[PDB]
Amino acid sequence: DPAVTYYRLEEVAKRNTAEETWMVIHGRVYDITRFLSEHPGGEELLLEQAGADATESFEDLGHSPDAREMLKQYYIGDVHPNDLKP
Amino acid sequence: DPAVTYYRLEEVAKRNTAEETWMVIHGRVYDITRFLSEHPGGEELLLEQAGADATESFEDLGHSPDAREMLKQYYIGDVHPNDLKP
Ligand code: HEM
Ligand code: HEM
């Protein structure tokens, strides 16, 4: 039994509202539903990319190592190997 | 949530010609009018489903992670909760 749960992007794409917000960052899936109201950068920016891969924006805006440590707590699984971009 | 724009499906259904083409995918509305001629799969498949929810078809062909990323530039709003089926 693998120690990691894998999610297809089709599944992630479904959680795209404030009720259940999932997001992909660097090949990993995060459930940031409860973090929406605590995000220093506001929640409109987040909701816009819910259900998607927001890796580019997360790096582009430059996030601190402190922000990256935070991420760890919303981690729920990895993107399925079939949906990774070689 | 805050700056979220909502549309009724009946509003979306009015945009079904090459003049102004909207399509629903996973509960979100996309204005793909300018993408019609860039679509690797052709413009016909897109116009055939213009103004409707094309989630099943999009997902059945198995679009790539790169195809999913492209969606972000056509996003214009969400489908009203009351129009979302069970
Ligand atoms: C992966 C989930 C995310 C977490 C845990 C997170 C966390 C944080 C934290 C802790 C800060 C405060 C400053 C810093 O440490 O850099 C911050 C700021 C910011 N974040 Fe995020 N963020 C996330 C996703 C995003 C996304 C997807 C966007 C773009 C839509 C974004 C845009 C911003 C912006 C613009 C600021 C700075 C706002 C200002 O200028 O004060 N963040 N984020
Ligand atoms: C408007 C949202 C859509 C976007 C952004 C999009 C994007 C793309 C992209 C980038 C490709 C090239 C290959 C890939 O990256 O997977 C592709 C191929 C294709 N698309 Fe779409 N597409 C959309 C909607 C649709 C719809 C509604 C249909 C009709 C079922 C469709 C049918 C196809 C087909 C048949 C291919 C060719 C696949 C192959 O070469 O085997 N697409 N699409």
From Swiss-Prot, chains A, B:
Main location: mitochondrion
Record PTM Phosphoserine, positions in chain: S64
Domain Cytochrome b5 heme-binding: 4-80
Highest taxon, organism lineage: Eukaryota
Binding-site residues for heme, renumbered to this chain: H39, H63
Record-level Gene Ontology MF annotations: enzyme activator activity; heme binding; metal ion binding; ubiquinol-cytochrome-c reductase activity
Keyword entries, A-Z: Acetylation, Electron transport, Heme, Iron, Membrane, Metal-binding, Mitochondrion, Mitochondrion outer membrane, Phosphoprotein, Transmembrane, Transmembrane helix, Transport
Residue numbers carrying N6-acetyllysine: K14
Compartment list: Mitochondrion outer membrane
GO CC aspect terms: intracellular membrane-bounded organelle; mitochondrial outer membrane; nitric-oxide synthase complex
One GO term of the biological process aspect: nitric oxide biosynthetic process
Function: Cytochrome b5 is a membrane-bound hemoprotein functioning as an electron carrier for several membrane-bound oxygenases.
Family statement drawn from the similarity comment of this UniProt entry: Belongs to the cytochrome b5 family.
Subunit composition and interactions: Component of a complex composed of cytochrome b5, NADH-cytochrome b5 reductase (CYB5R3) and MTARC2.
Name under which the protein is recorded: Cytochrome b5 type B
